[PDB]
Design a protein around this ligand. Sequence first.
Ligand SMILES: O=P(O)(O)OC[C@H]1O[C@H](OP(=O)(O)OP(=O)(O)O)[C@H](O)[C@@H]1O
Ligand SMILES: Nc1ccc(F)cc1C(=O)O
Ligand SMILES: Nc1ccc(F)cc1C(=O)O
Ligand SMILES: Nc1ccc(F)cc1C(=O)O
Ligand SMILES: Nc1ccc(F)cc1C(=O)O
Ligand SMILES: [Mg+2]
Ligand SMILES: [Mg+2]
Ligand SMILES: [Mg+2]
Ligand SMILES: [Mg+2]
Lengths: 344, 347
Amino acid sequence: VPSWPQILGRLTDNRDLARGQAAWAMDQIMTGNARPAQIAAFAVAMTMKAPTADEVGELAGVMLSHAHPLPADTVPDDAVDVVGTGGDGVNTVNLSTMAAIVVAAAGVPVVKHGNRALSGGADTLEALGVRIDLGPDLVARSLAEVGIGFCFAPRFHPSYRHAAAVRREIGVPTVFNLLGPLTNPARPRAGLIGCAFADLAEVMAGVFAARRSSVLVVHGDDGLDELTTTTTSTIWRVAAGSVDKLTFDPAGFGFARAQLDQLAGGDAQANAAAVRAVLGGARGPVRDAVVLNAAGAIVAHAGLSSRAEWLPAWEEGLRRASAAIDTGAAEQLLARWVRFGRQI
Amino acid sequence: VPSWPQILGRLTDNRDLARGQAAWAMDQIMTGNARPAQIAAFAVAMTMKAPTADEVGELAGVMLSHAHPLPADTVPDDAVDVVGTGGDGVNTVNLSTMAAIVVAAAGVPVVKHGNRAASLSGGADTLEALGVRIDLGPDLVARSLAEVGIGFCFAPRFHPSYRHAAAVRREIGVPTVFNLLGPLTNPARPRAGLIGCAFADLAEVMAGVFAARRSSVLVVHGDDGLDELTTTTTSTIWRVAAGSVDKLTFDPAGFGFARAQLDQLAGGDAQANAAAVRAVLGGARGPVRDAVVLNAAGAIVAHAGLSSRAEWLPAWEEGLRRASAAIDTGAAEQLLARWVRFGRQIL
Ligand SMILES: O=P(O)(O)OC[C@H]1O[C@H](OP(=O)(O)OP(=O)(O)O)[C@H](O)[C@@H]1O
Ligand SMILES: Nc1ccc(F)cc1C(=O)O
Ligand SMILES: Nc1ccc(F)cc1C(=O)O
Ligand SMILES: Nc1ccc(F)cc1C(=O)O
Ligand SMILES: Nc1ccc(F)cc1C(=O)O
Ligand SMILES: [Mg+2]
Ligand SMILES: [Mg+2]
Ligand SMILES: [Mg+2]
Ligand SMILES: [Mg+2]
């Protein structure tokens, strides 16, 4: 017989939950049956205990069972996401969002899950004239006609509203901050997944491993929830139900070391102008980081029909990402995406 | 600017708060400005980080500042409390309440802070079944104290601004640092006490808060988990005197008490527990009496600490003798009757 006092007691006692308990909690939360105080207690207690991959899998799984799906057979088998936990506290430019446009322009289907923020990916896309607010059918059409779509989290996860409000009221990051990347309603099988929390990246990787995804979970060793250019990054490579953790250094591909301030963003307008600069061919630290993350996504996608080995896949990813920019394909794709939105 | 994200982030990092942060959080909670989610996040985060005496002192001090006080010059200088955190999970007979009556009958003024269970039957519930009026305001508690030798401050009467916290406590069910606040926020501010703690890891923090106040207190945890001095085994006692704490292991066998079993101290509903009080005050021998005598002696020892630093073993011997005499002279049974009579005179 599950209950709040039982589950919360177990977590405050610093014990892992029994199987099913996390799912019960999340389902109470998703059906509107949990009091705000219970939601907050659970989010915090799970965080301070240190969630396991099995527990987070229950959370994300239950949350997905309440999401609006995309229609049958509208998401290609090899679609990729580019998305992070956020909360790295460094207010960067929208690296994942820029990378996603570049990856799509390179010919890889992209279905990005995202949200508002502090200009978040959704805010920046909105400021660029992209329609962020589309329902399942129109997202699937975006994907078919433009090669990219965007699932706005509030539109696809209406039942999460009680949790979202508690997250706003308490402000502190929790286990819930992990769920965004794990509950893309289109369920792409590949992804470049950023984690700001060094010790939870491994947990996120474990969740993806139990899905058969081909994913790179990445954490900049400077704290970025992206592949960084200022130093090394830790990568948890996920494929075939297993994890291969490694240290990644972009100097090995000839990237100059950048400073973190050179990647700082601003409001929606500033971050939109940064997008247009990069897609127009402006060289510099921001382009470098976009190219780096776009290549990472391309590598994860390569992991699905896994011909290539790691190094050759990276070399191919970097070349495709750079060419997608330099040939104007990325600029053109964004314009195409905006036109699509404007056609009703 | 203190804020929830700043304070909760600190706690979730496993760091002690900066000075004043716990006080800010408690101000928010006591003014109705903290959302239920913020209250619960804070209660839980403070519990899992492991609260310090300074943090809990801030919570308790702000809480006391919002409480109704007794009127000026109505609490004796040497009043004592006998109270625990509850939450030992054992559902015993009301040991603290029985001890309080015996202690007052031995001539030590008692002002008890308490509440309902709100089960099977808390101190407040049992007193009510005995015909004691638990629901009295400051002026009448003061009068009871002067006329009978004992008073009872009903927590919801004296701490109305705590209602947001109390509702959250009930919603989450799980024990938190807030479970420590009852014993630390007696609105009469007695300076001595026998204080039970059901959570062994937190008894030392409670002690530290009493030490910062220069109270004479024994904070006790039965090694069987009871928030009282037990007779089923040894107890841990943090003795607070002269603004300092030292930890002791206490064995009642050394005063000639036989070992009892938990079930010999098991409670029932308010009526059953009332009958247990009446049996003990009537002079019935057995394990409930033994437990009451022991806890009464402890409060008497704490009270003696106000004006002494007398030797431990003699202090206990006299405490136990005074508690036994209070029952066996009829004084305790008589005191309860005087207390019941006082409440009936109010109309
Ligand atoms: O319901 P629980 O969490 O187990 O708590 C049981 C009782 O212990 C505390 O009181 P106190 O020590 O004043 O009363 P008692 O020892 O006489 O019952 C609390 O206020 C309850 O009255
Ligand atoms: N971080 C996220 C990533 C994707 C998403 F859809 C939502 C969030 C979020 O935190 O609100
Ligand atoms: N329902 C939601 C789902 C995801 C999210 F990030 C926010 C909301 C919200 O209601 O604010
Ligand atoms: N106000 C209160 C003060 C103390 C307490 F224990 C409970 C309440 C309550 O409202 O239930
Ligand atoms: N346990 C307690 C001891 C004294 C008090 F005033 C309140 C409580 C309580 O938690 O309701
Ligand atoms: Mg990102
Ligand atoms: Mg980021
Ligand atoms: Mg008690
Ligand atoms: Mg007790």
